[PDB]
Design a protein around this ligand. Sequence first.
Ligand SMILES: N[C@@H](CCC(=O)N[C@@H](CS)C(=O)NCC(=O)O)C(=O)O
Ligand SMILES: N[C@@H](CCC(=O)N[C@@H](CS)C(=O)NCC(=O)O)C(=O)O
Lengths: 198, 198
Amino acid sequence: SMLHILGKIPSINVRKVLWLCTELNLPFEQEDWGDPAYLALNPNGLVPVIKDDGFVLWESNTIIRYLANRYGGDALYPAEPQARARVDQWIDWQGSDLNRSWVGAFLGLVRKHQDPAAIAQSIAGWTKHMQVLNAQLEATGAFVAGDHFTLADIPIGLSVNRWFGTPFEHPDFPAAKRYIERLATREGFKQYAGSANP
Amino acid sequence: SMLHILGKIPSINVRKVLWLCTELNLPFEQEDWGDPAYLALNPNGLVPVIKDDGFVLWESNTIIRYLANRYGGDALYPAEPQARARVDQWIDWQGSDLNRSWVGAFLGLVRKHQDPAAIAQSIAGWTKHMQVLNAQLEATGAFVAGDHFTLADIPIGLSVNRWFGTPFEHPDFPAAKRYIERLATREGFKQYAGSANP
Ligand SMILES: N[C@@H](CCC(=O)N[C@@H](CS)C(=O)NCC(=O)O)C(=O)O
Ligand SMILES: N[C@@H](CCC(=O)N[C@@H](CS)C(=O)NCC(=O)O)C(=O)O
């Protein structure tokens, strides 16, 4: 009956959900997933998928929106259309654009994609996206979507954690560094991010 | 002051916004975009981006959520957390997973990516995703997220339109065909989808 979260902890998309549950003080049961039993839940064969008293849901960014909508307060995921859109914008950018930019460099330098040119190119594309994000963080001076922690800081925070947790010569993005150090005081970030969880 | 939509009409992501505006009876000004003037609006250099009385927003799936939240009724984008999550799920699946699966085949067969193996492989991956979607449409027997038209049917409907508008030997997905014929009676689909707009 209680919330079940299916998917291995190393998955960044699974940790979006785990960290959100910590923010919400929502109890859960987590299960490692790399099978019809699973495909019955998520026909795409990807992690995470949740079960919430009979309600089955996949897509990590959808799942965090759902848990926020059901259990969370307004600050976490604001109802006002413009404020909500700023939060959605960075969630959607994380899930469709930013996460694609790191593939070669992450799989190559962290997960062991060993072509020097390909890695250099991924770092280049990742850098250009991190450049956009760094500029936003300078502009707010605080969190990704404004002056306080929101749902967007979960996908964005984990993605910045991934950037610093990938071994290469990092270009100076001071605002990104400020941001990750600010998130590091949060219980969920200590558990599901940091160098231990690239 | 009125809604400005920047981005060329052939873009599927731009047409998500154009079709939604038709559903909402929301007046707009559309401008073709393929430049600092643009990057000031969307630092990613992608289309679409909107301007709404000073409020600037990019990410097509974020933009359609925003316009729905601001101007639309509950049926279009329900407030109830589970119903809302079903809508978000397919929007997020469209924007992160399904749209990636067609790249090789679309660029090759529609936009002129001419490698026979690569095209066959894209068709394979596109087919497996369309297989998931077809199964969902069988399950509801109506629209992607349930018994009535929702925001999710805009990204999903345009994506199904793309599948049928791409010249190759299509595997039988009857429910997908039923669905696209159901959407074809909608004004926005006549304008921004069909064979004229793959
Ligand atoms: N759209 C899916 C993406 C899932 C996906 O494509 N890959 C998973 C593994 S199944 C992932 O976590 N990739 C990121 C990583 O390398 O940690 C979601 O966000 O839930
Ligand atoms: N995440 C962006 C995606 C934009 C993107 O990456 N490409 C645009 C062109 S700038 C597109 O519409 N691609 C689909 C197509 O081939 O029509 C959004 O949804 O707004």
